[PDB]
Amino acid sequence: RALEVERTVSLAEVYAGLPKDNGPFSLAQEIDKLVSQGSGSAGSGNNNLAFGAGTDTKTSLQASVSFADLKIREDYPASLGKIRRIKQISVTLPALLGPYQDVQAILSYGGCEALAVSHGMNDSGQFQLDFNLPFEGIAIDQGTLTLSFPNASMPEKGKQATMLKTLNDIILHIRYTIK
């Protein structure tokens, strides 16, 4: 039996709680700045908020985070176990949506490496979630976890340019096992 732990990470507390060399930033102020103009950047390293680089992703707003800086290994002592790996990641986006609109977001990793977000209420990627998985077995130390929002550019009149103005924080529910 594994020690089955649920961890909640707020991306605003990660981005604003960055070291002053890499440059901390407000999440909701930089999302309002990145969406309103064409593109830009906010942050440094793997804890950043930039646009897309590839083809047909240049209108997508991508929020990257690093598992090594979330410091999940310090939440419990190392005498319990060192096999600390992800069971499941879900993500809640507290926003203000339209009358019949949805949220489009892709939770990626550097197949079970991607995850689509559709409503943002403890949103696993699955239709029904059955433990009988994406990101399962990724260690909680190394990696980079990107949340990409397609159609997120207001100069390019994207449909998600209005929902991201109402977005104040991004919440990840990391379920991981210690064994």
Partner: protein, 509 residues
């Protein structure tokens, strides 16, 4: 003049997008409703502004872990008008105090004496709920059995007094189901009356000042209405008459509904007076809900969007007719209110920002004298809308006044906690215009126009407590048009200096 209906089903343009583990409640008590999302990962709320907008996600600073307990409930125990979290045990409650940004550290209040508290939900033959069956303004602990009604008085800070038996209620012990028991104040004297619902009739027990219940009286259901376990009785003020109405809902094969209206007027208010010398006054009241529905309907006729800042009904005086019984002469002074203001932070009614009078004489002809008069409410969303309702008319009048926030240091007023400075402006006059409604070409032109300017001096500063503030009218300008648009006779009286205690040191007429 007081007919209320509901509009079309309108699709709301924005919704707070987290529809799971949430409800609609005022978690902070500031008047506007919140969509409190207490899910597995986050806890917080979106507030609903009265101008249609939804606030973004505001996280609660502290939530108890026992908020998700199946037997905890939100009640008002500390007496501050907030919904605290309570777990009622038989001899010890656990109380988490609402402090308007989340909750505080939970206590364990042990009940004194032989007090063994009832448990809500733990019996199907009893109703254990929080109701004011004494009229005190506190949520007491009531237990409605089939035989008696026992009340434990809420003493604040989780404490509960010795139980009080309120006699007079009784049902058949077989045919008693507590789900048909409804504790609601019907007249407005303060204690909650007791309604028990049968099929084809409706027992109503009048609470006698929290000392017992009267003889019941039945209100038989009309032809085609019967009750069952799928039906529902709602009690609400859906009329704007000041008194609640009983709404019965039958959901099966089509939802159809009925409303019981018990009275027309709100009871126990002063109606008529008389000095037995030939003079009598009759007073008529209207709810502020009706003064909002008339204001909201006339705004949508000109394509404007009306916003209400008074979430609670204030039962106002509307018409006070005077009659001299000797000469037969009558005078009917009709009032009209608008721009009600309720402050969310101090949780207090700030008044109205626009009062009309209409002195119309009835001699046993002469035109009525309408007097518009604006007042400062203190709410900056209401005060900035008042000056768009004035009579402009002449295009040569001097510039209108604004309030003057001022700081007091070194014995003089030096200009400028902006909330307390606006709160001091409550009840200050801002304008008054007097008209005569004769149906002439000068009916819309005022007889005189008076404008005022309040100021507020801060006498000592307040860090966590309120400042000391002194509000006064610092300059008043009056006009005299005599229903002539051009050529008025204007004057002004300005105060320049005041000393430490508000006596004038330099005045200019």
């Amino acid at each position: 003049m007081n007919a209320v209906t509901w509009g079309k089903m309108q699709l709301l343009p924005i919704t707070p997008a987290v529809q799971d583990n949430a409800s609609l409640m005022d978690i902070n008590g500031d008047g506007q409703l919140d969509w409190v999302i207490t899910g597995p990962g986050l806890r917080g709320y979106h507030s609903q502004h009265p101008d249609g907008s939804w606030t973004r996600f505001t996280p609660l600073h502290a939530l108890p872990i026992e908020y998700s307990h199946p037997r905890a409930q939100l009640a008002d125990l500390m007496g501050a008008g907030l919904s605290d979290l309570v777990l009622i045990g038989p001899k010890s409650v656990r109380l988490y105090v609402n402090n308007r940004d989340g909750f505080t550290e939970g206590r364990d209040v042990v009940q004194s004496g032989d007090i063994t508290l009832p448990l809500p939900g733990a019996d199907a033959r009893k109703l254990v709920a929080f109701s004011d069956v004494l009229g005190s303004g506190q949520a007491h602990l009531v237990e409605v059995s089939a035989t008696q009604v026992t009340c434990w008085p809420n003493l604040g800070h989780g404490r509960f007094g010795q139980p009080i038996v309120l006699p007079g209620f009784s049902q058949s012990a077989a045919s008693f189901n507590p789900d048909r028991v409804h504790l609601a104040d019907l007249d407005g004297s303060g204690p909650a009356d007791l309604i028990y619902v049968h099929a084809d009739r409706l027992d109503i027990f009048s609470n006698e000042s929290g000392n017992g219940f009267a003889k019941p009286f039945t209100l038989s259901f009309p032809d085609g209405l019967r009750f069952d376990d799928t039906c529902q009785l709602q009690v609400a003020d859906v009329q704007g008459l000041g008194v609640v109405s009983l709404i019965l809902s039958v959901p099966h094969m089509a939802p159809h509904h009925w409303r019981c209206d018990l009275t027309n007027a709100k009871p126990w208010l002063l109606s008529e007076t008389n000095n037995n010398m030939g003079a009598n006054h009759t007073l008529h009241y209207r709810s502020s809900v009706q003064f909002w529905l008339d204001e909201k309907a006339a705004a949508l006729a000109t394509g404007q969007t009306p916003v209400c800042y008074l979430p609670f009904p204030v039962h106002t005086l509307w018409q006070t007719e005077t009659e001299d019984e000797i000469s037969g002469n009558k005078l009917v002074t009709t009032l009209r209110y608008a721009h009600g203001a309720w402050d969310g932070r101090e949780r207090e009614f700030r008044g109205f920002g626009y009062v009309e009078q209409t002195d119309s004489h009835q001699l046993a002809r002469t035109p009525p004298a309408l007097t518009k008069s604006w007042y400062a409410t203190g709410l900056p969303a209401v005060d900035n809308a008042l000056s768009a309702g004035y009579w402009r008319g002449d295009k040569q009048a001097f510039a209108g006044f604004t309030p003057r926030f001022t700081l007091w240091k070194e014995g003089k007023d030096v200009p400028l906690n902006l909330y307390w400075l606006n709160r001091a402006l409550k009840g200050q006059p801002l304008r008054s215009e007097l008209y005569g409604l004769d149906g002439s070409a000068q009916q819309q032109i005022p007889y005189t126009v008076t404008e005022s300017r309040p100021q507020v001096r801060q006498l000592q500063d307040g860090a966590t407590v309120s400042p000391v503030l002194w509000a006064s009218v610092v300059e008043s300008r009056s006009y005299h048009y005599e229903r002539i648009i051009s050529d008025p006779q204007c004057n002004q009286d300005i105060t320049l200096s005041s000393d430490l205690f508000g006596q004038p040191l330099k005045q200019v007429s």
